Amino acid sequence: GEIKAIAQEIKAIAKEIKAIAWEIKAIAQG
Amino acid sequence: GEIKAIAQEIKAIAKEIKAIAWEIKAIAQG
Amino acid sequence: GEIKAIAQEIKAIAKEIKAIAWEIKAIAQG
Amino acid sequence: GEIKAIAQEIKAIAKEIKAIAWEIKAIAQG
Amino acid sequence: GEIKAIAQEIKAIAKEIKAIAWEIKAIAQG
Amino acid sequence: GEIKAIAQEIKAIAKEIKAIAWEIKAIAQG
């Protein structure tokens, strides 16, 4: 239900934070 | 219903941590 | 009741985290 | 009861995230 | 209890964004 | 069940972000 849907959206946000962190690492390395 | 309301606020906080990470990337870039 | 009242306190905290993210955006832009 | 106790612990975690966000703002400004 | 666990992981992620911001500040400074 | 499984996946993502943060520090230091 809705609590599962909210948990899934928090997981999606965490994946986007990981992608941003990876981009910051690439910028720092270049 | 109140646990769902709390979960929605945790989701909102996760979105703001993503927003902060995005701004750290902007600082890293220039 | 009390769990709703706690959820409302967490909503206020989430708004302050959003305000901090907005301040970091202003810092990144300056 | 126990759901109230859990809600109070989630509020404490939200406050801790706010403190971390405030540290990030100070770091970004320095 | 699982919403608390997710909140704890958002706190952990915020701490890692703080660690990244520390490094990005140093890079921006020179 | 599924909310616990999602919480565990968010923990795994938090560990990936921690690894990226560690590597950014190593890059900054080198």
Cα(E30)–Cα(F2) distance, rounded to whole angstroms? 47
Nearest partner of B14 among F18, F19, A12, F22, judged by Cα: A12
Task: In whole angstroms, give the CA distance from residue B6 to residue C9.
Answer: 9
User: What resolution in angstroms, rounded to 1 decimal?
Assistant: 1.4
DSSP state of A15: H
Domains in chain D: boundaries? 1-30
Q: Does A19 touch chain E (CB under 8 A)?
A: no
Interface test with E, best of F9, F16, F24, F29 (most E CBs within 10 A): F24
Determined by: X-ray
Query: Is the minimum CB–CB distance between B18 and chain A shorter than 8 Å?
Result: yes
Per residue, the 3-state secondary structure of chain C, as one string, reads CHHHHHHHHHHHHHHHHHHHHHHHHHHHHC
